[PDB]
Amino acid sequence: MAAAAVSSAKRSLRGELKQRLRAMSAEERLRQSRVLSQKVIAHSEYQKSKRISIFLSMQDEIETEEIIKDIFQRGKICFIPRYRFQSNHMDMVRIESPEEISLLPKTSWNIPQPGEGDVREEALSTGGLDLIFMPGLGFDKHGNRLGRGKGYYDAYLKRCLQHQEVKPYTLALAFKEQICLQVPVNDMKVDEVLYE
Ligand SMILES: N[C@@H]1N[C@@H]2NC[C@@H](CN(C=O)c3ccc(C(=O)N[C@H](CCC(=O)O)C(=O)O)cc3)N[C@H]2[C@H](O)N1
Ligand SMILES: [Mg+2]
Ligand SMILES: [Mg+2]
Ligand SMILES: [Mg+2]
Ligand SMILES: [Mg+2]
């Protein structure tokens, strides 16, 4: 019953956040994304990190396009999500240029990812990750995160520990509209939430 009340609070907050995210203009989402891109590019954990996981942005997320271009300009090794919907499991798989992204097939969320038989280097098979850009629907200032529901990033963070001594730094990228007083939890916290 306590579990269910937690789920109910998460669901209600998701509906609130989604409505705000729906209510934002394309131009404005683009403005806050530009502000975050400059913040990330100046960020010391980003500047020092060699192996990075970043997401490919949905319409309700901070746009990561400029960060990706910077990643490859700085010769960082870049991994993106590859989600297997049948088992609710995600890996982070290597891409070798920003331009490759444009040729990939897309999922039912209209996001690019390498297809089923494209054999890819996985981040945990070749060293793990220094830094993971964390998407999500909401975050509070304690670093709690409200994801879309099925906990694929929480599960992936747990998995990272099985390959690395040092846990990846987790940096969320949020609209100011996505910052909440308290995210209902219980769930993995992020190290830092960036917003305007
Ligand atoms: N740009 C990135 N790409 C990432 N790629 C992997 C991915 C998985 N994903 C798709 O790639 C995905 C989306 C929703 C649910 C789930 O948790 N949600 C529905 C309710 C959400 C809907 O009604 O709006 C349900 O609980 O199943 C699980 C996996 N999540 C993406 C992430 O959220 N944003
Ligand atoms: Mg809604
Ligand atoms: Mg409200
Ligand atoms: Mg402007
Ligand atoms: Mg959406």
Ligand SMILES: [Mg+2]
């Ligand atoms: Mg360097």
Ligand SMILES: [Mg+2]
């Ligand atoms: Mg699949």
Ligand SMILES: [Mg+2]
């Ligand atoms: Mg992996």
Ligand SMILES: [Mg+2]
């Ligand atoms: Mg699909």
Ligand SMILES: [Mg+2]
């Ligand atoms: Mg996993």
Ligand code: NI
């Ligand atoms: Ni897998």
Ligand code: NI
């Ligand atoms: Ni608090």
